[PDB]
Amino acid sequence: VVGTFKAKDLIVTPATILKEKPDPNNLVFGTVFTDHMLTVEWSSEFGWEKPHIKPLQNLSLHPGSSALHYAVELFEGLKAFRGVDNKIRLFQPNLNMDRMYRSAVRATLPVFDKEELLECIQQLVKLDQEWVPYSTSASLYIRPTFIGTEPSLGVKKPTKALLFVLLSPVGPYFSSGTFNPVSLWANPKYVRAWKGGTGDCKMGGNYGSSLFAQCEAVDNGCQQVLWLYGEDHQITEVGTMNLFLYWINEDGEEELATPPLDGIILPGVTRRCILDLAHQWGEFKVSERYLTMDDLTTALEGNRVREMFGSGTACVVCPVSDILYKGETIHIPTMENGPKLASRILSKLTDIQYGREERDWTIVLS
Amino acid sequence: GTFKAKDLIVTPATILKEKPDPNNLVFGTVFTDHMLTVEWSSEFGWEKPHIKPLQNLSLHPGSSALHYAVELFEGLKAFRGVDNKIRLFQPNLNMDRMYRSAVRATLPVFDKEELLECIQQLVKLDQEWVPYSTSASLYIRPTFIGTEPSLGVKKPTKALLFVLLSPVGPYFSSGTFNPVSLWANPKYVRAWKGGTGDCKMGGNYGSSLFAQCEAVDNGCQQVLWLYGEDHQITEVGTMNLFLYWINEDGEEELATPPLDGIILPGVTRRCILDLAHQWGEFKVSERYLTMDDLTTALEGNRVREMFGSGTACVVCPVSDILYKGETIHIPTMENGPKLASRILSKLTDIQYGREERDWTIVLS
Ligand SMILES: CNC(=O)c1ccn2c(N3C(=O)CC(C(F)(F)F)=NC3=O)c(-c3ccccn3)nc2c1
Ligand SMILES: CNC(=O)c1ccn2c(N3C(=O)CC(C(F)(F)F)=NC3=O)c(-c3ccccn3)nc2c1
Ligand SMILES: *Cc1c(COP(=O)(O)O)cnc(C)c1O
Ligand SMILES: *Cc1c(COP(=O)(O)O)cnc(C)c1O
Ligand SMILES: [Mg+2]
Ligand SMILES: [Mg+2]
């Protein structure tokens, strides 16, 4: 019936008692939640209900809900930043709405009007705007979440769903607020995602399967998993981050390389932004290309590697110092090379996020 | 550690729901009066198990089951016998598989015997829901979810184990073989080497819905899951795949894909392999089967039967595969189907207590 919900229909139930804000320098990522959340119910029978902004509450779900049985679920991750000018900005949020819509279609969750969801998210951040931290090293994490709630054990396209948005204040990625280079666990026994799978979507099913390898990484003194793919051991992603390699390539050219979007790579907003910046600067070759462990070890032997880093909303730029592979520790000289490019990218993205320079990539809160 | 069945806290419902007509049941849509719930935390371990009225779950919206598919499930049945004794069927294999799935999911381990006793006590309390029909059964859905209120992608420090009961009818309303048409599109891959395809983890299923919709759009009832450059035939929807044929060496053979990481080790699959091995009437091979193997065999009139196996269907004969724009006929229904019928008769006779078997347990 109701094709899609509208921000103009928002029903706002303000909280009576507002919670004390956390210290932005003693925050664990995604553990502290703001006063309010967005919820929107859908059914096949009646379509989208009116959207609600209401106090953070537990969800009341039928125990047969397909999100709990068949991972009929997806999420997004984007941030609000309090600028040096005290204006709150979103960063490329229409890219998150596009990616969420694409994920919903592949999940068989009901489609929604992307502009109306973004306006609902803006109104939620506006209401909880004092949760956007007063710190140029902290931000407000925005977690749109979309779950199948049909009370049927049939493996089927859902006839009931809930779209909701949580807000979580977060500090710097590492407590130190400076580059803490990560050690990676590279075990080809595990595969994050495969050709013909859903690795290019933020569907919950891609993450539950990763926890065992992450635990093995921590057991072996590593902070993140290096996700290897195929007989040639392609390096694909670092934990929940896109993978960048800054090196002299096989042709002796200075190059920033990242795996191509061939179906096993999550198309990161950060990844997109870094490729755009590197293209704009025009100071070295920019290549979306396959990179193997043998490519990397051959390059290290030839002193051709400068930097390796992950990219993502949570870290921005996460330098890599070491990879544990085939029972050996392989040193990556990222931190002995500045890291010049990683630092330059972090400085440029944070200058844009916190309004130190104007950009088409930011929207001031409505 | 573990919860213990001896600690069960039973809160009976004071209002009972009307039992459904056993001949008008939609699979997994009707739920019984009671459920099992058991809370876990890293801090305190397993809480006492509860049998209480079916209720909504109250979950923190940050629960890792909702964000990162930190979840697994099982599927097994209780059957009201011809002698009116309620029986479970190979339930220890479900407990083994659930335990193994929990380890792969990084959910907390539990005592398999304690969970089975808790399930028996739940079915016993709701035993009148086990249908009065030799074509209907009580579906048992153990479910295990991460309830950590954290957006970190991490091993959960909070979890809920629960069990739902759902009365269900025959797989097809007719209660006779309705052979399935399969949609074979290699662009979709159910599972990969180094993934979780050999575990009943929720994450393996959410990704499948789009392909299932495409199957139904093209007049097919199930997806044929193809893998690799050679187009291995792996599974049929949520069922293991059996091929009864004359193999390349001219030998009568029952073939099924091997457990190399992309196959869910079905209880029904296990039972069928056990029966075929016991009978000793033909070769039994856990081997790769490709679309080219199958079409070469069909061209040589070497195929007898193809069927899916699973708790829901038992034996699901396959009549056709839509592949590369061609409808490929499988002569299953023109060959009896003799083996499919024999397997269905044997397993249903055991389930409904028409013959004694080590595979069944009479309810606690
Ligand atoms: C072996 N371990 C892994 O490979 C691993 C994987 C993911 N990780 C994250 N992490 C999320 O938890 C969530 C997250 C998204 F996408 F939700 F924002 N991004 C992420 O980087 C973090 C993290 C996140 C935020 C702040 C500090 N640390 N650390 C890891 C480690
Ligand atoms: C393109 N479509 C597919 O490939 C497809 C997939 C799974 N399917 C099931 N089905 C579950 O829905 C659930 C289920 C488990 F495992 F939970 F018991 N088994 C299952 O066979 C059913 C079904 C189940 C019970 C009764 C009648 N029909 N039909 C399909 C079709
Ligand atoms: C979210 C995510 C990324 C990073 O995407 P951003 O939009 O830059 O936050 C990378 N890899 C995986 C697997 C992800 O889920
Ligand atoms: C559950 C399941 C089966 C069948 O298992 P049974 O124990 O026989 O019910 C087959 N394949 C997949 C993918 C499954 O999830
Ligand atoms: Mg519109
Ligand atoms: Mg041929």
From Swiss-Prot, chain A:
<dbReference type="GO" id="GO:0052655">
    <property type="term" value="F:L-valine-2-oxoglutarate transaminase activity"/>
</dbReference>
<dbReference type="InterPro" id="IPR043131">
    <property type="entry name" value="BCAT-like_N"/>
</dbReference>
<keyword id="KW-0443">Lipid metabolism</keyword>
<comment type="function">
    <text>Catalyzes the first reaction in the catabolism of the essential branched chain amino acids leucine, isoleucine, and valine.</text>
</comment>
<keyword id="KW-0007">Acetylation</keyword>
<dbReference type="GO" id="GO:0052656">
    <property type="term" value="F:L-isoleucine-2-oxoglutarate transaminase activity"/>
</dbReference>
<keyword id="KW-0808">Transferase</keyword>
<comment type="subunit">
    <text>Homodimer.</text>
</comment>
<keyword id="KW-0963">Cytoplasm</keyword>
<dbReference type="GO" id="GO:0006629">
    <property type="term" value="P:lipid metabolic process"/>
</dbReference>
<dbReference type="GO" id="GO:0052654">
    <property type="term" value="F:L-leucine-2-oxoglutarate transaminase activity"/>
</dbReference>
<dbReference type="GO" id="GO:0005739">
    <property type="term" value="C:mitochondrion"/>
</dbReference>
<protein>
    <recommendedName>
        <fullName>Branched-chain-amino-acid aminotransferase, cytosolic</fullName>
        <ecNumber>2.6.1.42</ecNumber>
    </recommendedName>
</protein>
<dbReference type="InterPro" id="IPR001544">
    <property type="entry name" value="Aminotrans_IV"/>
</dbReference>
<dbReference type="InterPro" id="IPR033939">
    <property type="entry name" value="BCAT_family"/>
</dbReference>
<dbReference type="GO" id="GO:0009099">
    <property type="term" value="P:L-valine biosynthetic process"/>
</dbReference>
<dbReference type="InterPro" id="IPR043132">
    <property type="entry name" value="BCAT-like_C"/>
</dbReference>
<keyword id="KW-0100">Branched-chain amino acid biosynthesis</keyword>
<keyword id="KW-0028">Amino-acid biosynthesis</keyword>
<feature type="modified residue" description="N6-(pyridoxal phosphate)lysine">
    <location>
        <position position="202"/>
    </location>
</feature>
<dbReference type="InterPro" id="IPR005786">
    <property type="entry name" value="B_amino_transII"/>
</dbReference>
<comment type="similarity">
    <text>Belongs to the class-IV pyridoxal-phosphate-dependent aminotransferase family.</text>
</comment>
<dbReference type="GO" id="GO:0009082">
    <property type="term" value="P:branched-chain amino acid biosynthetic process"/>
</dbReference>
<dbReference type="GO" id="GO:0009083">
    <property type="term" value="P:branched-chain amino acid catabolic process"/>
</dbReference>
<dbReference type="GO" id="GO:0005829">
    <property type="term" value="C:cytosol"/>
</dbReference>
<dbReference type="GO" id="GO:0004084">
    <property type="term" value="F:branched-chain-amino-acid transaminase activity"/>
</dbReference>
<dbReference type="InterPro" id="IPR018300">
    <property type="entry name" value="Aminotrans_IV_CS"/>
</dbReference>
<keyword id="KW-0663">Pyridoxal phosphate</keyword>
<dbReference type="InterPro" id="IPR036038">
    <property type="entry name" value="Aminotransferase-like"/>
</dbReference>
<dbReference type="GO" id="GO:0009098">
    <property type="term" value="P:L-leucine biosynthetic process"/>
</dbReference>
<dbReference type="Pfam" id="PF01063">
    <property type="entry name" value="Aminotran_4"/>
</dbReference>
<dbReference type="GO" id="GO:0000082">
    <property type="term" value="P:G1/S transition of mitotic cell cycle"/>
</dbReference>
<dbReference type="GO" id="GO:0005737">
    <property type="term" value="C:cytoplasm"/>
</dbReference>
<keyword id="KW-0032">Aminotransferase</keyword>
